Structures are given as structure tokens and as C-alpha cells.
Amino acid sequence: KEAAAELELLNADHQHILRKLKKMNNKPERFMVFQLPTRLPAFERPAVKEEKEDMERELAGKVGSIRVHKSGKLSVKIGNVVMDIGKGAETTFLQDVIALSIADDASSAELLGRVDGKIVVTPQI
Amino acid sequence: INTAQDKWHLLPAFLKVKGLVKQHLDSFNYFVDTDLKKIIKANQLILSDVDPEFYLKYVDIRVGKKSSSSTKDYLTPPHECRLRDMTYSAPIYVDIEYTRGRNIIMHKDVEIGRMPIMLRSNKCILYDADESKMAKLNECPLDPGGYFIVNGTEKVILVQEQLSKNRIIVEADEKKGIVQASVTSSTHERKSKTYVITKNGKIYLKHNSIAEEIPIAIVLKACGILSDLEIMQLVCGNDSSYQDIFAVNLEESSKLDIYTQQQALEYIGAKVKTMRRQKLTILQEGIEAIATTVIAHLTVEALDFREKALYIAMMTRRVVMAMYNPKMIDDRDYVGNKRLELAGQLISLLFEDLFKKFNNDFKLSIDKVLKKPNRAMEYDALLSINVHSNNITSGLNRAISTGNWSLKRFKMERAGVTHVLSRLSYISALGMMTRISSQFEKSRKVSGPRALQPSQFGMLCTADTPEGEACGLVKNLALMTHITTDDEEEPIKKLCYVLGVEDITLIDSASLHLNYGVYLNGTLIGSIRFPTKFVTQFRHLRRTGKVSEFISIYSNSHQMAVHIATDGGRICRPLIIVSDGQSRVKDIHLRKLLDGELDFDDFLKLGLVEYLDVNEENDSYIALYEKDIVPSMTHLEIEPFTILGAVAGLIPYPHHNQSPRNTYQCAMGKQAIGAIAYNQFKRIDTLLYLMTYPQQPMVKTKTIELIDYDKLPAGQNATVAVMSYSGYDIEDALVLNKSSIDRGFGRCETRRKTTTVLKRYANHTQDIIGGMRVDENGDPIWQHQSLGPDGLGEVGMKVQSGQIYINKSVPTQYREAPVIYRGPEPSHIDQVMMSVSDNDQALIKVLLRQNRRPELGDKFSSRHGQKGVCGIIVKQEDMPFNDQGIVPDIIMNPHGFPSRMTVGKMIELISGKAGVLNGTLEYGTCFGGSKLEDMSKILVDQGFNYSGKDMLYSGITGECLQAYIFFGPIYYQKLKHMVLDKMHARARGPRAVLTRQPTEGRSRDGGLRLGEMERDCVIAYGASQLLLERLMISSDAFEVDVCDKCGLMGYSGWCTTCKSAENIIKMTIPYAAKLLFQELLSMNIAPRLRLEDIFQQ
Amino acid sequence: DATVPSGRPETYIWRYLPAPPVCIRPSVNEDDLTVKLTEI
Amino acid sequence: MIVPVRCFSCGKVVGDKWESYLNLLQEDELDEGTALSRLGLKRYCCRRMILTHVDLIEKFLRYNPLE
Amino acid sequence: ELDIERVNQTLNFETNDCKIVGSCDIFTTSRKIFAYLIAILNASYPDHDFSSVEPTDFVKTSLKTFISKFENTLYSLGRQPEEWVWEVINSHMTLSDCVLFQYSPSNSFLEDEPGYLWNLIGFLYNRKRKRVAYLYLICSRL
Ligand SMILES: [Zn+2]
């Protein structure tokens, strides 16, 4: 029964990730730390989905897409590999902000924003 | 053509490429190919303190091959090393980088000692020998290998099992000793062991490098966790029942007024021992005690004490759960909590410390030339290597041969690490392999480690164990098992973050006990939100072989954890994966497995079968047969009879017997005698019991097909009439046929070796072999009848009880010290071997042969634990006979069946009888075999009764017996316990020079001890002069001279402490009481005898 | 009970030490006691 | 190691029926139980003499001095 | 060498509450020999001057009398002294035709070392080979 309970809670976290992403739009300087895998597919050449599946950074932009499925779910695809997504850290209690460090002589701690939550993306093994 | 009963063919596919001695062979192959490098790299460089420029570093290492040689070196073959009493070994070629003069020089192929190599491993010459090369090298291809030949004696390193090393184990009892071990062991970077104990309801932290134990709140503050609310959130959570239990430990931190990590570290900085070298502060010490002193496998490297603080917090959460519920404790005897330490692991402990002590003793002699004169005369530093290279050889050889384990660096003093390989049977050589030792054999308890656990289903053999003083402390591994190989875990850790854990430095300590946390080898790593999706995607990476097999993941629920173990020494067991109620191995795969292609480990790569750990069997639900697969199953047994090991597969129909009976067979299959090897006539061993005409069992087993037992069997098929006869078979005695023994039923043969070494001495004089001593003409005297001209006895001649067969003489006078055959029966010389050992001195081994037949008193047994002795031998016209005229070879009493409940012996006889009438050998394999309802079909087909009961006539009176006699072939095996080697008797003989009582042992003249419990018996009879005679008059009587005024004992009728022979009385006394008094006078007490007259006046 | 002349309490201090007979400690190889007496 | 000359339970001579037992199985092949009856081993005490005989003299003779 | 290493492995051991450390060594580097041995003493213990006690107690005793109690103390320490040692030190030095000396003064320089019990120091001068062995045994207590 337990795999069904984690299915509906992921289904509960898929509406809960859509509200907290759409409400967060255009509220300035209010962030969300969210976890990607350490190694990404290559983009000078596209590593195909089953090849990135096997072995398991400077980039430009428009590297992926957060697709909203018609049924109830969401799935990040980057390049051509397809990942799955869930609000999967915890309901955090410790309060979180983001601070920019400056190296040597313009030395400043710029306070950017405040973390809403944390969502994770895993490869769809 | 293929069906549900054909998946057992994976078991010959498993054992083909693996074998049964792989836990010895793979470990030694791992050591000489991987772990030799990881010892050289751990201490590569030699630093000369005098002139810190003359360094010396070892580039790499290899055994048995020079780098310039394209071929492996010639080794003396393993059988020649048995005969010449050498050590079967191989040279360790290191090559070296050193400094000489003013430039550095590489030198190639320095031999540093010799490594005693295991048989059938990579460097052994028996590796891939095609059974015609075995014959040239005089080796048996059915020999298992897996052992060492050290000084001729073949020695096996047993499988040791320890408790699980780097994991947490919770104990408890009444009086509240809730202790928590964690025996930390990074190789010997540190070897440490912490505790956590509750005293007075207050949690402490004991460690053997601390003066007095630290409370628990001021040691998490010694780590980074100092907020003192999160300590109530790392060990309690939101559980209100646990917040009461830990709240006493909070205020104790305030009671010592400890509030910061600076002040917390300074508490334990003044509690340490072994302050030696640096004179650093208590801050610099207390921050070092958390670095690499308490939990040593979790070394910290920087400021972040987070995951180590989370370690001690998750230890003390398991304490608080144990205080609340006292049943949340860990079984110390559970098989998942064990690690099996194999032979490569032990030799890597041993070879490292000798290479430590090599490099220490080479450094303290590399400076004994530098600080001495002839400064300009440089030296190559490679001429003192052989000064200490005979300590690598002699320390490896001694520790295997003695079995002693003296490791100064590692601090372990284990005894009984090795054993001599047993050559009683073919089964003894294979039962001494697959054998597991334990740590409990120093201190005693009741009903703990001696009870078998249900967690050894398929992992350990459920019947092969000794009976008596070691029942359940020696144990045996099953057929389809595998011991896990230890592998790297930081690739496995980095796979966990990609699969969706988030790191322990990223997670809030408040909400940590709401999600399952993953545990890579007991260490908390992250916290997954969706665990069963994480576990399913980790099996799927293992079944596709991306991440390795022998990497087990299991999702606990009460701990709410997801454990991932990858360390070595776990016991796996292959199972067939089922999915959605359907076994994944279809009949197309068994069709491919039979006809050559797609072996075992193609069933692993293609995702069909799977190794399961003991722990991963919790997260499973395993079907036994294909008809039992319900949709909630997740595995299927390859074959259920592998619950039993190698020795317990000899039993026919074990599932019909009672279970203590199947355990007595395992001890007695190793004791039965038959064929040993194919070079059993080319070998000269200490005691070798053979059988003349051994037969393979009529009822056999799949398990003895696999281990090739029916090519070197130990026993004969006796015709057995189960009936009561002659009254000489009452309580386990068995009636025997005389005409069977005359034809060779049960007739055996003993072989014994005798080694003399003609040692040469420092006086340049040598032991010599004498000559034939004739008398009165050219014929020998009695003691030289079997001698021959060169003093070594002639091959084929009969030696008997007093003659000489090696006439050696020691020193030019020669003191004659020949060997004298002192046996109660004669024996023919069959093999005299003249050779020279390694140190160039003579070595004579003489083998002596003796034929012997069943006497009254030899032990026979069936394969059902029914040991028995021969009670009478009967003339064969006195035996009962059927219509065809068959008489039994053995008659067995019907009274050994009802109390012992061996119904599987009643099926061995019918399957044996129906099979021999059909012409086919039958099967009595466990949970299967041939069926009684169609063995009784073959048996009516001939015209015999279905039940195996025949109408026998009486041999004595001629008449029909009034019962039908259960009659047919049982396989009997003859044991080594023979009454010729057990009957002994002593009238008078040698006495021990101290106690002057008769000597000890059997192989002396003798002396039977009458001790402390039969003395009690004859006091109870009141027999007082027997007790006087049996204890004093005929054990140690001693006429002594006491003095009457002193009470001390004088010599020769003369007292010494008063110089007079005047009042000396002469008495008879036990000599042990004389020896007592003169040991009391030396301890400065004086037992003064007060005497008196016996007779009234 | 110092009526016996060995009663006296100073007889419990090792002034003199008896060397035991060689029957008590033989030599097969020196004995453990024989090597202790010489050391004393 | 080599075939017993006689059956143990009867004394029927079975040592001359090992060389001929292997020829009935190897050529003109039979199913090991009519090759016994063709040699004339009726009693089961005599059939078990050569059916469960493991012949070890052939393997022992591989390890002699070549001579 | 190897045999010298063996006979030094003999002479270094420790029993229950005693620790004996001594060895033998042979190297070529009665009026002129008085300075020839104090340099051996200085190199043997580089923390005490031995140019001070010049008219010392060199008991010029028989080497057979010396090896007698040198063997007796190995019986007395549970060692069972192995005889080949006395050929090995012969085989490098020609033990027969040589003279023995012994630094045993009234108060030796080890009485101030804590844990000192007794010593046995042997000098074996050679003439044809100039090979002096410095056989020394220092029994301590720990
Ligand atoms: Zn007296």
C-alpha cells in the first residue's frame, strides 16, 4: 500500500509545486533553492537519454523545460533526457536567505532574497 | 521439455565457475593482486634520520615473477613440497628506488622473503591444469585446494566471523546497562571503540582513551550542534515520550556551565590519556579527540562537525528508544550483524605488520653505516635487505603453521587461526573447508550463540555442526552462497544525491525525523522524501548492472531508515527475481543454459537472478516453489535443498529423519573411511585410513553428484535385514556376517609415516644410518630381519613389535638410537623415501602399511546418525535367507528406529532395493528425491513386496520366521574408531618423575585415572580397603620416615632437624602427600605430623 | 600462641628461605623454580 | 579400487563380469539393468556388486612412475 | 651480517619485570690499548666521558672463565643458551688465541641510570685481525 501512498503524495506535491511556482512569478528578489543532479548532459553535443543513463559548470541558457502534463503531473526535461520532479526536501523550519560575496576590494554582502521552498529533480531511472 | 522442476540447473551453473572453496581462493587472489599494492603504498618511503637525503621507496610489488622474465618462475610442485617437508611458496619480487653515492638508482626484482601461496589460486601451478598435468605433478584433480603447504603439513586458514565492524549495536539488561558499541576500524589509522551508557538515567560517553566519561550534551556541543533545542530535536523529535527521557541530560550541560563549543572542547581536553608528543593545548586536544579519536571511521577534516554530530545523535536516539521500550535492542547473534573474515583479509593483516617490522629493522640499520666512518665510501643500501628478508619468510611461515596471531601494531592475539587439513575422508577435506569459526570460544554463557537462528536459511548449513563442546560455535556455509567483496563507497554515495537524497549539511535538524534518512554503511547521509521510489530505482540500477551487485539496499520501517551496505564479509545467496506474480526466468533461458550458452552471471547481467544479503531479505517475500508465487512475492528459490551444506548432502532423505539425527551424520561422515584422492598411494601421510573396495551409494543425492563424492566414496552397500537376532545387537550393536568379511566387506587399511632427520651437527659430525648386524654366519639377528643392507628397512617386508626399520646412530663414537616398531600387530613396509630437505640434511620417511578386517568392536554407521559397534560375527549358515538365498551382511535391531525416528532410512532401503532391481541409482535428495509410491511400483514389478518386507527363513532352525523381514540394501560406512587402536591395558610401567604416579595418555604404557567422582562412589559403598588400595597401595605407595617429636620426614631412618635416629617411625604414605609436604616446607609453612599408636593398652 | 618457639611474629618475614629439594623441582631444561632460586 | 571377485552376500563370482559389463554398455548399448540380467545377475546382492562399483584402479594407475 | 644479527636477536629480550638489552659487535676501527677502548666506550654511550677514568679496573681474566658465567647467566634468565653463537663469534674473530678485558670498576657509570640492576661487559682484543668485540649485557627493570 505504501507505494500508493507515496504516489498520491507526489500527486499532492504536483499541484503544490504548480501554485508555489506561479505565485512566485514577478515577486522581485524572492528565490527558491532547488536541487539538480551534479552531472548534467553535454550540450556542445547532445548526449542521448540512454547514454546519460549509463555513467550517471559553464552553460549558456535555455537548457531545459518544465513541462506540465495534462493529467496531474510535471516533468523537467533538459536537452533530451527526461527527469521527474517533486517538492522533496522537507517543510523547512530554519529561515533562509541568499548572500552574494565580493572578492577583495568592493567587499560587500548583498542580500538578494528569501527562499520559498526546495524542489528536487532526479533522472528517471 | 522444460518446466518448474528444471530451475535447479542454475546450481551446477553457479558452482561451475565459482566452486565451493572460492571464499578461500578469491580472497587470496585479491590479496596477491590488489592488497599487495595497498600495503606498499601505505608505507612506501624509508626516511633516514641521519642525513635526510638517503631515502628509499618501493615502486611496486609482484609475487612469483621477475619483470624481465616473460615466464613465471619455476616452483617446486605441491606434492614434492609435501614429501620433502618444504613450504610451497613463491618469491616476492619487489623493485626498489634508492639513493647511492650522489645519484638515485632504480633496482629491479629485489626478493624480499617468500610468500606461502595457496593451492589452486592464481600463482599456484595447479591453476588451469587439465587433469593430465595433475597426474604429472602427482596431484588429485578432485582436491579442493584452498590451503597452504607449510613445512610439509597442509594447513587451512578457517573462515573467521566477527561482529559487524563499523555499525552500531544496542544492548540492554536489568540494572540499566544500556551500552552501545561501535568498534571503529580504519585499517590501523585508528582502531577504536566507543560506548554510550546510561547511568542513573543520564546518558554518558565512555571511551578507552578518556580518563572519565563525558555526558552527552557537552559532547554534541563539542561538535557543531550547540543550539540546545536541536539536541532535543536530533534525539527526541516531536515524540513527547522521548522528551522526558532525555531532558535530564540537558540541564547537566548548564550545571557544568558549558555553553559554547570553545568551552565544550576544553572539558574533554583535560580528560584524555596518552599525551605524548606535541604539548598542544586542551583546546587543541579536545578538538583532536573529535577528529580521529572517538569514532575513527568518521574522520573529520575541516571545521564542519555536522555529520559526526548527527552520528552520535543517532546513536543516542537508539538509546532513548531502548530506555522507553526495552525490546528495541539488537540481536548480537543475527547473521546480518556478522562479518566473515576470509584468508586474504587475515594475511593482509599479517603481511603488513611484518613489512612494518621489516622497514623499522631496516631503518635502524641503514643509519648504522651513515653515522660511522668511511664517509666518502658510499654503500648501495641493498646488501642488508637479506639480513631481514628471512623474517618475512619465517614470520609468514610460523604464523600459518603455529596458527598463532601475534600482531604488535594491530593489537590482536588470536589463537587457533589455522588447522591441519583433515585427510580422514574426501568429505573431511571439503568439510574442513567451508567451516566457520567464532569469537565465543573464550567465555561461557547459556542459549546464546549456540542456538541457530532463522536468519541462516540458505546462508549457513542448518545441520553441519559438531556435537559436544562446540555445538553451534563451529558452523558451515551452504552451497549457493557468496561472500561479498568490499568496494568503494564514494561512487555509491555520489549516486545517492543524483537519485534524490539531499545532504545532511543541507537539511534542518528539526524536520530530520519526519523523513527516511539514508545510511551508507550506518553513517547518515541524507533524507529522502519518497523512499520506496528511491529503493526501487536503486535495485533497478543494480539489476541492470550499473552499480555493482553485492551492494544491498533495504528499507527499514520502525527505524524509518533506508540502509545501503557495501562493505565486504556479508553472506549473499542467489535468488530468482519474480515480478508481477511471475518468475522472470522463463523456459527459454533454461533451454539456453543447458546447451552451452548463457551461463550463470549471464543470469545476473540480463537481470534474471540476484544476490540477496541477510538484511535485504527483510525487504522481500520469497517463494519456495513456482506454484506458490502470489503477486506480492518478489523472489523465488533456485533450489531448496541448498539449505544444507556439503557434508549434510550425503544424507539420503534428510527431511524424513529427525533433526538431531542429521547432525550426527555430519560429524560421522567426516569420520567414515574410504578413498581420499587419486595420489593416495603416492603420498606419505601421518595416518591414512583407506578402504579396499569402496562402493558408491545406491541411494544418492544431487548434492553428492555436485561435490563429486561418488568418484571417491567412503562406504559399501550392505545387505541389511532389519530384525532382532542373537541378542548381541541390543543397544546399537549390529550383527555381522562372517562370509561377508572373508570376501572383503568392510575391510580397511591403515598407513602411517615415520620421519627421521639425519641431522649434521656443529661439531662437523653427522648422524649416520647403521648396517645389518649378522650373527654366526650371513643371516641377520631378530631386530635386523626386516632391515636390508643400508640400514633402512626393505619395502615389502613384515615388521613386528620390536624390530628395527631405520637403524640410525647419533655421535668418533656412535650411540645407537634406531627406531623400533612398537605396535600390537605387525605391518608391512610399503614405501621408503630417501630425500634431503631445504637446509641440506637427510630426511627419511618410511611409510608402514597394515591391513585389518572387522573385529568385534569396530564402529559402522549408516548415513542416518545411527552409529553402531560390531557385536558378533555370524557363520553365514546361521544367517536368515530368502527364497533366492540372499543372506544379510548386517542385521540391524528394530529398536533403533522408534526412539530415533529415522524414517528416511526406511526409504533408503526401498529406494536402494527398487533401484538395484531396476538397474538405476535412485535419489534421496532433500525435499525431493525418488518417491515411495513408485519405488514400490518397481518392487512389485519383479515380484517382491511393495513394502520391502520379505519372508525370510531361519538359518538356525530352518523354519519360516513369523514376521516379514524388512530387507534390502543400506549404504554402510566404516568409521576410524577401531578397537585395535583403543584396547590398551597397563600393569606397571613408567612413572612421572615429579609425582611418581603412573604416567598419562594412551600412547604411553598408560594409567587410567580414578578421579574425584569414583572416589565418591566407593565411599558410598563404605569399601575402605579398596579405597586404600586403589588410591595408595597400587598408585603411589611410599615408605617414609617420619620423626615423632618434630613431625617432619627424615631420610634413612635419621632425622635432620634433630640430629638423631632415635624416635624415627616408618610409615607408608601417598607420594603426592610426600610431595605436598615438601612443597609446604618451601612456602614456609610446616605440616608437623602428630602420630599415635594403633593399639589400646 | 607463642609457647612454641616458632610462635613469635617475626618468623613471618623472609630472613632465611629454604631451597626446595631437587625432587620438588627436577630438570628435564631447567625448571621454573630452579631459575627463580638463582635469580633470588 | 578394482572389482570384487565374489559377491559379498552369496559368493557368486562377479569379477569376471566387469570386463563384459562395460562392453554391453559401451557397444550394443543396454540400459544398465538388462545388461545386468544378460550377464546373469538375478539376486540384488549380486547386482549391487558391479552396479555400484566405482573403478579406481584406472585412476590410480595414472600416477605411477612411468617405468 | 646475518649471523651477527641472529646473535644480537639472542641478547635482547625482556621477561616478567626485567628488560635485558645487550649485544655484540666486531670492528677494527697494554699501554696503548687504554685509549683504544675508551673510544669504544664513548661511541657506545655518547653522553659520558671516558677519558676521565684512565687507571680503571680492567680485570684481565681468562676468557673461559668469562664465557662460563656468561653462559650461566643465560641459564639464570631462562634462555637455554644456544651453543652456535659461540662458534659464530669465533668464526669472525678466532676466539681461541685472543685475550679478554672487562670494564668493571668500583662504581660503574650506569648506577645513576634509574632501573639499573646489573651489567656484563666483555672486551675481546684481537692481535692478528685487530677485531675487538664489545659484548655487553645491561639488565634493567620495567
Ligand atoms: Zn625430628
Ligand SMILES: [Zn+2]
Ligand atoms: Zn567377492
Ligand SMILES: [Zn+2]
Ligand atoms: Zn550374491
